[PDB]
Amino acid sequence: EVRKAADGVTVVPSAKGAAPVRLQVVDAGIIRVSADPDGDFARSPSLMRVPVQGDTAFQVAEQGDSVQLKTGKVTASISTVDGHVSFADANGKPVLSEVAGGRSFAPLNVEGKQYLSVRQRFQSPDDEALYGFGQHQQGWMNQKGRNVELQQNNIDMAVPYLVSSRNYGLLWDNNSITRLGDPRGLQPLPKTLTLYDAKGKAGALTARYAINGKHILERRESEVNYQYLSDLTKYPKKAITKDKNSRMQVTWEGEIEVLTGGEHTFSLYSSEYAKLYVDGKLVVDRWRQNWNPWNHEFKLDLEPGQRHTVKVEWDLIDPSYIALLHRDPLPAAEAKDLSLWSEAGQMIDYYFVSADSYDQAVAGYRALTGKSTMLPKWAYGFWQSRERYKSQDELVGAVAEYRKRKLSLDNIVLDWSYWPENAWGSHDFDPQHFPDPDGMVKAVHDMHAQIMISIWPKFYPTTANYKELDAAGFMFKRNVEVGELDWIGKGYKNSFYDPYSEKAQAIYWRQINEKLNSKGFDAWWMDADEPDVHSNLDIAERKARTTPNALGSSTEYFNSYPLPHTHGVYVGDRAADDKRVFILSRKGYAGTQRNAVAVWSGDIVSRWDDMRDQISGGVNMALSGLPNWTFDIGGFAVEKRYEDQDPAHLPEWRELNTRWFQFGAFVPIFRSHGQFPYREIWNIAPEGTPFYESMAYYNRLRSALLPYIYSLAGDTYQRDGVIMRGMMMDFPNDPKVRDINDQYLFGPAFLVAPVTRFGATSRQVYLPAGSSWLEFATGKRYEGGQSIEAAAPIERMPLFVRAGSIVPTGPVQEYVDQVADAPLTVVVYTGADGQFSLYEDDGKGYGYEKGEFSRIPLVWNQAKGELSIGKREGSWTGMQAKRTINVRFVDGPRDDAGALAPKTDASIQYDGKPVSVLQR
């Protein structure tokens, strides 16, 4: 049967067991595909979707084995035999096809409900590149051929939108644990491997337990598994020590042999120090803080009948976590497919986005899930934070010292534990350490800074606020019922609230409005919203302690917690006054950009590996659709050699933080944070060192680049754009940029290549083909399509500017708008044609929604040597009707290249009427 609707068609395939399939035209280039064994297409209401104003017109043709739906941009074909869908572009060129017979549905019976675990396979060629699907920690730029599980965790963020080099995007509308690649996930070591111990006896590896390097006991183990709290009960009791000094060690040693040949993948999930050798070669060498283990993946080509040695070396403190897990190759018929799997839902439901560019793929995500709210302009200046300022004098003193040193600072952050110890969730202030919070806020504001404060979803059962939420049915009960104690003092019972209902959101915000917003705080730091009820619980317990919610089970809704949670604060803060909202959330999700939510990569560590990993994490985050993203400059948690401030390791501490500070100055939000040692510029290193010189320079350069940066921020809303750009976005025809994991573009102009090795004074940098490049620090010109050894002394990061870039700049400022009516300096990097439409607005309220913004077109014609400043369009409260515009040309080596106050070459008065500036 074929049934036509006003917005698409439903096909009931003739083959036995093939599911009915429905197509809906959302817009000319956006097609919804739903497949449901029952044929009714009933699902829980989508959380990520917003309505779309689109052209839903289409034509139908029915020919033989297929039904064709045609829009102005797409032809979608449906098999009448098995229902499989294939998409072609306007010219009939194939873009993406489902696998015929490529759907899977399996029953899942949990929490009194019935769900389907669903899988869709698509045909995928060897040369397809894939990006997005959230923000992850393997250092993978390209996701092709990789296995990636969406499971909200401290440092691992789920957003189910994927982008392809084949000119499409896919939104997978499911809120449960989800898998790209292998639908099975990671297996215990012996499931598809034969094991031999250190004496060659089959069936186990040899495990040895030690305290302070002294052997305690040895035993055979067929699994390497202390992954979660429930697994720790098997750790040998005589091998445990809780001394403040003392450490523990475990080794596993033996050999593995596979049962089927091919590419095998692995994860060493670990905290504290962990090494792994295969065939004598070191393949994992990692440190994380004991309470935040994560996956460290590797892969090997292996064939049956051949043994390979394995040696795991773990050095830990109580408690720490480890697991060695494995995936064997999929069947050949499946192994090359693009596969998407979800644990719980009602049907397969996804959206095909036709995309002539990577930019258009991101724009389709914003159409489907919401435009990205504008953030306040001050959010794009420098943020200073600490875990934690322990008194209001410490916080205010940090602001005062930035001002005394004339460094640039816009925003200061107050972390957790400002409340009385036994009153988490009251939002009260301990008067010993915060005697006058209203005065704290006023003192910060009087120094022209904004203040953000930590608010968790966490409540102690003794607080009035807990009891209010609980009496209304909006407190998860299990964590308090089992008596789980947190880490504060002697340990406190606690739980987290249920954000899914609008009544819960109203209560949560009302408590915060009365206690905190009334005091003038500017921004909300919405931490731990995975939610992180008790760290390192197994997944069954995380689910049980967050269920039921107002809509259903935490199995159906495992990844969606931050969306309603941040929504409630966004709506309440926006209703309370006319200023723009700012939220920093530890997790994003599909749609969170519509609630004025920036995100960060979580409690990563002060390690060069983690720094490097954030480059590909940030690029994939932007291609997933979330444009306001940051990290802790220098890392969150630190090894003992850094916390104890061992002078032997001070040079590396300073060099890591300096390189990471250079990098942070060129990501969407610029923010210093972390655990002790203190992270303010002068506490990293004193004035006189190259570290201080470097941090001060990039701190001030950021303020001069604000006109450029904020124009990009305007276009995250106006043009559904991004700020951090993968190199493939602007060079989609250069295959060499598809897999490079340590370079990116900061807007259209700046190629950024952070230095991630101790003692490096240079690094290799690949310059994309098709453009020439100007070295920011010197003006030296380099042709595209080459790798160079770029100079990188401790104090400077490799930075190159694309020929034809127009970069609006201003004077160095200690805070946003310090100098009112500042002159604008347009810097033109010559060598090709270019254009840049400068967006400006009041930076403060929602007037831009009603058209209160201006655009000044800037056009550079390389043949003529002419910068055209076009007619201004639009106006806003506080706009400069007449203004000074300086112009500076960089066409090659120049002595003041990269200077904070460089020489200008022309200066004109602009009143909105078009004006031309010639280089000759």
Neighbouring-strand partners of residue 725: 745
Query: In this chain, which stretch among 52-60, 513-521, 565-573, 667-675 interacts with K ion, using CB under 5 A?
Result: 565-573
Print the binding letters for residues 439-468 with K ion: x by CB under 5 A, - otherwise: ------------------------------
Can 337 be counted among the known catalytic residues?
no
Can 905 be counted among the known catalytic residues?
no
Instruction: CB nearer to K ion: give 57 or 575.
Output: 575
Query: In this chain, which stretch among 38-46, 533-541, 568-576, 721-729 interacts with K ion, using CB under 5 A?
Result: 568-576
Instruction: CB nearer to K ion: give 579 or 757.
Output: 579
Residue closest to K ion (Cβ):
579
What is the DSSP secondary-structure string of 749-817?
TEEE----STT-SEEEEEEPTTS-EEETTT--EE-SSEEEEEE--TT---EEEETT-EEEE----SSTT
378: tokens are 């001050």
Pick from 113, 219, 234, 579 the residue near K ion by CB under 5 A.
579
Instruction: CB nearer to K ion: give 573 or 603.
Output: 573
Cα separation, 389 vs 416, in Å, equals: 9
Q: Identify whether the C-beta of residue 231 lies closer than 8 Å to the C-beta of residue 225.
A: yes
Q: Identify whether the C-beta of residue 400 lies closer than 8 Å to the C-beta of residue 448.
A: no
**E-only strand ranges, 356-502:** 382-384, 411-414, 450-455, 458-459, 495-496
Query: In this chain, which stretch among 295-303, 506-514, 579-587, 911-919 interacts with K ion, using CB under 5 A?
Result: 579-587
* Minimum CB–partner distance for residue 455 and K ion (Å): 15
Half-sphere exposure of 604 (CA within 13 A, CB side): 29
Query: In this chain, which stretch among 132-140, 571-579, 672-680, 706-714 interacts with K ion, using CB under 5 A?
Result: 571-579
Pick the catalytic residue from 484, 527, 814, 840: 527
Cα separation, 730 vs 738, in Å, equals: 11
* Minimum CB–partner distance for residue 876 and K ion (Å): 18
Amino acid at the residue 316: L
Query: In this chain, which stretch among 207-215, 569-577, 599-607, 775-783 interacts with K ion, using CB under 5 A?
Result: 569-577
Can 530 be counted among the known catalytic residues?
yes
Across the beta sheet with 915-918, the strand order is 834-840, 854-861, 866-869, 915-918
Instruction: CB nearer to K ion: give 98 or 573.
Output: 573
Instruction: CB nearer to K ion: give 484 or 522.
Output: 522
Query: In this chain, which stretch among 328-336, 574-582, 697-705, 781-789 interacts with K ion, using CB under 5 A?
Result: 574-582
* Minimum CB–partner distance for residue 518 and K ion (Å): 13
Query: In this chain, which stretch among 110-118, 147-155, 572-580, 857-865 interacts with K ion, using CB under 5 A?
Result: 572-580
Instruction: CB nearer to K ion: give 374 or 681.
Output: 374
* Minimum CB–partner distance for residue 575 and K ion (Å): 8
Instruction: CB nearer to K ion: give 358 or 509.
Output: 509
Instruction: CB nearer to K ion: give 449 or 633.
Output: 449
Cα separation, 173 vs 509, in Å, equals: 28
* Minimum CB–partner distance for residue 816 and K ion (Å): 18
Amino acid at the residue 799: L
Amino acid at the residue 504: A
Closest CA to 297 of 137, 521, 523, 133: 137
Q: Identify whether the C-beta of residue 459 lies closer than 8 Å to the C-beta of residue 421.
A: no
CA dihedral 419, 421, 425, 427 (to 10 degrees): -10
Print the binding letters for residues 514-553 with K ion: x by CB under 5 A, - otherwise: ----------------------------------------
Across the beta sheet with 906-910, the strand order is 806-809, 824-829, 883-890, 906-910
Instruction: CB nearer to K ion: give 512 or 705.
Output: 512
Phi/psi of residue 690, nearest 5 degrees: -65, -30
Total of chain residues touching K ion, rule CB under 5 A: 3
What is the DSSP secondary-structure string of 158-199?
---EEEETTTEEEEE---S-EEES-TT--EETTSSEEEEETT
* Minimum CB–partner distance for residue 524 and K ion (Å): 11
Instruction: CB nearer to K ion: give 461 or 520.
Output: 520
Cα separation, 848 vs 596, in Å, equals: 14
* Minimum CB–partner distance for residue 581 and K ion (Å): 6
| H-run or E-run covering 34 | strand 30-35
Instruction: CB nearer to K ion: give 514 or 739.
Output: 514
Looking at residue 866, the DSSP 8-state letter turns out to be E
Pick the catalytic residue from 128, 173, 603, 814: 603
| H-run or E-run covering 724 | strand 724-725
Query: In this chain, which stretch among 197-205, 293-301, 432-440, 570-578 interacts with K ion, using CB under 5 A?
Result: 570-578
* Minimum CB–partner distance for residue 580 and K ion (Å): 7
* Minimum CB–partner distance for residue 572 and K ion (Å): 9
What is the DSSP secondary-structure string of 421-446?
TT-TTS----TTT-S-HHHHHHHHHH
Query: In this chain, which stretch among 176-184, 555-563, 576-584, 855-863 interacts with K ion, using CB under 5 A?
Result: 576-584
Angle made by CA atoms 915, 919, 920, in degrees to the nearest 5 = 110
Instruction: CB nearer to K ion: give 371 or 388.
Output: 371
* Minimum CB–partner distance for residue 505 and K ion (Å): 16
Looking at residue 627, the DSSP 8-state letter turns out to be -
Report how far apart, in Å, the C-alpha atoms of 791 and of each of 598, 613, 849 are. Answer: 33, 22, 45
* Minimum CB–partner distance for residue 844 and K ion (Å): 10
Those residues with Cβ within 8 angstroms of residue 733's Cβ, 6 or more apart along the chain or in another chain = 770
Pick the catalytic residue from 484, 530, 613, 814: 530
* Minimum CB–partner distance for residue 579 and K ion (Å): 4
* Minimum CB–partner distance for residue 517 and K ion (Å): 9
Of residues 353-392, which lie at the interface with K ion (CB under 5 A)? none
Instruction: CB nearer to K ion: give 513 or 818.
Output: 513
Cα separation, 836 vs 749, in Å, equals: 10
Instruction: Check residue 575 for interaction with K ion (CB under 5 A).
Output: no
Angle made by CA atoms 108, 269, 157, in degrees to the nearest 5 = 65
Pick from 91, 199, 577, 913 the residue near K ion by CB under 5 A.
577
Report how far apart, in Å, the C-alpha atoms of 424 and of each of 4, 294, 428, 438, 518 are. Answer: 56, 28, 8, 20, 19
The two beta strands, 854-861 and 113-122, are: unpaired
Q: Identify whether the C-beta of residue 896 lies closer than 8 Å to the C-beta of residue 905.
A: no
**Active-site positions?**
527, 530, 603
Interacting residues toward K ion by CB under 5 A = 573, 577, 579
